[PDB]
Amino acid sequence: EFDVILEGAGEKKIGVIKVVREIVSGLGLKEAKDLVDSAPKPLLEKVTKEAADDAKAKLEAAGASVTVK
Amino acid sequence: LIKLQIQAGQANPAPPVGPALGQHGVNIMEFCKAYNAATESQRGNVIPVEITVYEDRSFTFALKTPPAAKLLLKAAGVQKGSGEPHKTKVAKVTWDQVREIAETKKADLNANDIDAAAKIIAGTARSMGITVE
Amino acid sequence: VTAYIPGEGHNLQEHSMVLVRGGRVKDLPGVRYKIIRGSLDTQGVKNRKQARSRYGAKKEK
Amino acid sequence: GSVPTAERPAAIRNVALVGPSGGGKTTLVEALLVAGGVLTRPGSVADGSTVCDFDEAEIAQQRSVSLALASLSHNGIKVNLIDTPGYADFVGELRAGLRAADCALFVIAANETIDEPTKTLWQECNEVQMPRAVVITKLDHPRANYDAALTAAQEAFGDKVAPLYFPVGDGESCKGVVGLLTRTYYDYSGGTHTARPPDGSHDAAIAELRGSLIEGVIEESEDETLMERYLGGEEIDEAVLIADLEKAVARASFFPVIPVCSQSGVGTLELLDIISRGFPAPPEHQLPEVFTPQGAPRKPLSCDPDGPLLAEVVKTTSDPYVGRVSLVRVFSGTIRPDATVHVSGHFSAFTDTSGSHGAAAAADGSTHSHADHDEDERIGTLSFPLGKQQRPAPTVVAGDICAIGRLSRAETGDTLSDKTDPLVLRPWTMPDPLLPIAVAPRAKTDEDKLSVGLQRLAAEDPTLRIEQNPETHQIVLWCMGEAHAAVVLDALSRRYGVSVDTVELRVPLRETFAGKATGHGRHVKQSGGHGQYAVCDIEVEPLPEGSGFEFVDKVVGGAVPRQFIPSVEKGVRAQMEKGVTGESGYPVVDIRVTLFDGKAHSVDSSDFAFQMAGALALRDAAAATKINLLEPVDDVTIVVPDDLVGTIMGDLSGRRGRVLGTDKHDADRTVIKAEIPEVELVRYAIDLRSMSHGAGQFRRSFARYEPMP
Ligand SMILES: Nc1nc2c(ncn2[C@@H]2O[C@H](COP(=O)(O)OP(=O)(O)NP(=O)(O)O)[C@@H](O)[C@H]2O)c(=O)[nH]1
């Protein structure tokens, strides 16, 4: 049971939004754009450790500042 | 707060899980996929699941050991239990299978010693009409 | 009146609109009229190719 | 009033107003037209002075059972007010109304909440991709709560539903509404529409509503940066916000909430502005796909009068003097007086998919079963339907909905286009009636005109499936319920003057045996010279269902010349057809015969003697043994929530419904399969609507026959 929290966007905003859409289904360019802008929504909850750290690696590769315990 | 016994290899059943899961706000699809993954890793027999609920509608699944009745059925090699227990015997089990199921029930149960689970499974075999030897 | 229905196949079921015509048939002693094929509810007979106009069947394509 | 005139589809709106039974759509349309100058004063169906509720049955039952069209062009944009019935028994009328329009409006009550039939209506209106704008009415009632209805709408159909105008009033006689995007409250304390900036009583609440609406609209809008600018310290430009709202409506993804005081005219002008600006244009609207005659794909026609011709007839009327006036749903091309178009009957092969027992494709009419037709006709008189009156118009541009009089072949859904390039617009979902009711024609002229009357009815209501049973030669009418059957009977006894006699529905039954039996057939008939003496012995046993009729001949010695055995078989078949259950038998099916003895004479007995011998032999065999009466069983599709599972399937114990599985559609809805003989399915519609409280539908499919117990 892990909750993923994203802290910023950076210089790679488009890639961050795309990868955020890839991680969790149901978000568009605009909804996830607003989410990473601020809109603090806890996207995924109680996910497994492998999902958490793969999302961490993908988001960091996208230029996003994410924290995974 | 409900519990069910359901086949391992298939999710979204018609009779047992559907309506009871539905009237509790549990997401059907996510539970189905997670249970199917766990039961494809298991691949032994059907598994019983307990449903625990929260106020935030999040669902947690509790997966126990394979049912003792089903384990005795596979150990005796027969599929359907005896229609007249203690009056007609369909199969016989040696103590190796009974003790393996006793270790299973030790892992899943409150029993302090394997002998307690062995006598539990012997009682189950009596209930089915299956001799323990 | 009783009217004969020419052709091999007729769609007519009980109490449907038709168009009767004069005509004699020996085999039926009391029949004096014929039903025109291809008018009102009556359908021109199917698979008909020769002497088509008598049976109300359209030309093939 | 003045005729609404538009010369471009983007200046035309096609709105099929939808709502529950007791929706007040007719009064709302009257108020909208009174605002637009079509009517001087608004009428009420209670008085009977309305426009849409012109039919006799609408006044008779005090609720809209037949659709109507009202035309009104304000601010240069033509708005077509298509009122639609809300009753469950007229789902096809509303389906056709949607299919002949580019927009839909949900008009509900503020003092009453949403019931399951209206939930099903919203579900269907979703799977057509129609932008639905929520209209809150019945504000005059003391129990009216716009906020409660809006909260329930935002809870049920997602948070995407966002209010556009927020009313300000006492809750009984509301004094007006607030313009959120426009920052302008419209007061009616004097009875006149005064667009003014709000005094500031709820200025914080006004700002909250504006921000919520902006986030709901911008998040769907193309420009991602709009929300960032709004949150960055800049107030978004009003024109940009209005354009975003129009575009969001155009995607059929946004559901604005527009409360209207239909009792006092408050909310009418703003709703008209909403229609004029936010509604998608028919060229931008997703037109129904257009089929070539043989099924090859074709791009949908451009919604332009300059483009190729395209239209569709979706209604039909009647008149003593003038004739038939049929509505036309024009998608493309220019309609001009005294022109020739193509009248296509859906090319019923497209709608030939299944159809239950009757295989209803389009317009039925067993004499001309399925539409499937191609007709080229000169058009009659152009007109715009305004209740019983029809306003003529010189030209019909693309996207507009018109009605032509003096027609003969026009039927509901008949695609109209150029006769050189004929077209079949995709037929909408056609609901099969599931309540077969038998009738009998009192006189000959009654049924002789009944064919024409039912063809006209299908031209008005294709949901009426008709299939005349050939076995008992009694016409059988299928309906959706008491409302549909009542409307059909009223129109039949009034619109064409046909006297009717309702009779019990007849269902057939067969004969099969229970075990092996032997039969003896003797023929003796004095003739004087060459004998007439036949003694046949047979042996008949039952056969499994579908195994047909098996005949075996085992005459020892060959006393019967071989040309007489077919006469024996013919007599056996005749006895099977007449029946063997006592003296009032039924056609025997699925039995095997073994004729193992015979005798003959050649000169006299050609066929009849051995036919009678075989009939007596089969009578002797079947009387000695047992027999069975076979009735049919069908597969039943039942989808009810988890709570109605027990309430239904326990009653099926008294209704002999054997369950096979309670498949889980999702959380609550559960798919139930059971095989029930058609005996119990005679009145299941009313019973179902009773037990499920108007929240139950079913399907029926014939499976096989079963012995009767
Ligand atoms: N008390 C009250 N009666 C209303 C209201 N709106 C309509 N009615 C009543 O309902 C009848 C016609 O209105 P309504 O049912 O909404 O329109 P309809 O065309 O008959 N039905 P539908 O809305 O489904 O098309 C009349 O008897 C009228 O008095 C309302 O807000 N309050």
**DSSP string over B101-123:** HHHHHHHHS--SSHHHHHHHHHH
Q: Which residues pair with D97 in a beta bridge?
A: none
Helix, coil or strand: residue D630 = strand
Terminal-to-terminal C-alpha distance of chain C: 38
CA D506, CA D473: separation in Å to the nearest integer? 10
Tokens (6 digits) for A50: 């492998």
**List of long-range contacts for C31-38, beta carbons under 8 Å, 24+ apart:** C31/C2, C31/C3, C31/C4, C32/C1, C32/C2, C33/C1, C33/C2, C33/C3, C33/C4, C34/C3, C34/C4, C34/C5, C34/C6, C35/C3, C35/C4, C35/C5, C35/C6, C37/C5, C37/C6, C37/C7, C37/C10
Q: Which amino acid is at D406?
A: R
Amino acid at D173: S
Listed by the residue before each break, gaps in chain A with C–N over 2.5 Å are none
Resolution in A: 4.7
Residues B12, B17: Cα–Cα separation, whole Å = 7
**Pairwise CA distance, residues D424 & D409, whole Å:** 15
For the stretch D616-654, what's the b/e string if a residue is b when 16 or more beta carbons lie within 10 angstroms of its beta carbon? bbbbbbbeebebbebbbbbebebebbbebbeebbeebee
Query: What would the DSSP string read from start to end of D179-213?
Result: ETTTTEEEE-TTSS-EEE---STTHHHHHHHHHHH
Task: Provide the β-strand partners of residue D629.
Answer: D511
Nearest by CB to residue D444, choosing from C13, C15, C41, is C15
Ligand 1 pocket: which residues have CB below 6 Å?
Answer: D 19, 21-27, 44-46, 53, 62-64, 83, 86, 137-138, 140-141, 262-263
Q: Are D149 and D262 in contact (CB under 8 A)?
A: no
Judged by 3 or more CB pairs under 8 A, whether A touches D is yes
Nearest to D411 by CA among D395, D390, D422, D427: D427
CA dist., res. D441 & res. D695, Å (int): 35
Q: Which of D16, D26, D64, D50 is closest to D329 using CA atoms?
A: D16
Strands (E), chain B: 2-6, 47-53, 59-63, 92-93, 131-132
Q: What is the DSSP string of D122-158?
A: HHHHHTTT--EEEEEE-TTSTT--HHHHHHHHHHHS-
DSSP D565-618: HHHHHHHHHHHHHH--STTS---B-SEEEEE-B----SSS-SSHHHHHHHHHHH
For the beta carbon of residue C35, count every other beta carbon within 10 angstroms.
19
- For residue D24, the CA-to-ligand 1 centroid distance in Å is 3
Using CA atoms, how far apart are residues D129 and D249, in angstroms rounded to an integer?
Answer: 11
What is d(CA D323, CA D224) in angstroms, rounded to the nearest whole number? 57
The pair phi, psi for residue D197, each rounded to 5°, is -60, 140
Task: Report whether B88 contacts B96 (CB < 8 A).
Answer: no
Residues in chain C with CB shorter than 8 Å from the CB of D451 are 16-17, 41
Torsion sign, CA atoms D584, D588, D592, D594? positive
CA dist A4 and B10 (Å) reads 30
> Relative to the CA of D27, which ligand 1 atom is closest?
13
Find the farthest-apart pair of alpha carbons in chain B and give their distance in angstroms, rounded: 52
Residue D425, classed as helix, strand or coil, is strand
- The DSSP-derived string for D553-566 is E--SS--S-TTSHH
**CB distance D473–C41 less than 8 Å?**
no
Experimentally, how was this structure solved? cryo-EM
Residues D85 and D88: their CA atoms lie apart, in Å, by 9
Instruction: List, comma-separated, the residues after which chain C is broken, a break being a C to N distance over 2.5 A; otherwise answer none.
Output: none
CA-CA-CA-CA dihedral for D680, D685, D690, D691, to nearest 10:
60
D55: DSSP letter: S
CB D365 within 8 A of CB D346: no
Chains that touch D (3 or more CB pairs under 8 A): A, B, C
Q: Please answer whether residues D485 and D602 qualify as being in contact, where contact means their C-beta atoms are separated by less than 8 angstroms.
A: no
Q: D204: which 2 tokens?
A: 């914080």
Are D98 and D32 spatial neighbours (Cβ–Cβ below 8 Å)? Answer: no
Which secondary-structure segment (H or E) carries D383?
Answer: strand D381-386
> How many residues does the structure list for chain B?
133
Q: Is D223 left (phi over 0), alpha (psi -120 to 50) or beta?
A: beta
Mutate to test the interface with D, among A13, A17, A27, A37 (most CBs of D within 10 A): A37
Please report, as a single letter, which amino acid is at residue B27.
Answer: N
Q: Which chain D residues have a beta carbon less than 8 Å from that of C14?
A: 473
Q: How far is D166 from chain A (nearest CA, A)?
A: 26
User: Of chain D residues 617-676, which have a CB less than 8 A from chain B?
Assistant: 642-643, 645, 661-664, 666-668, 670-671
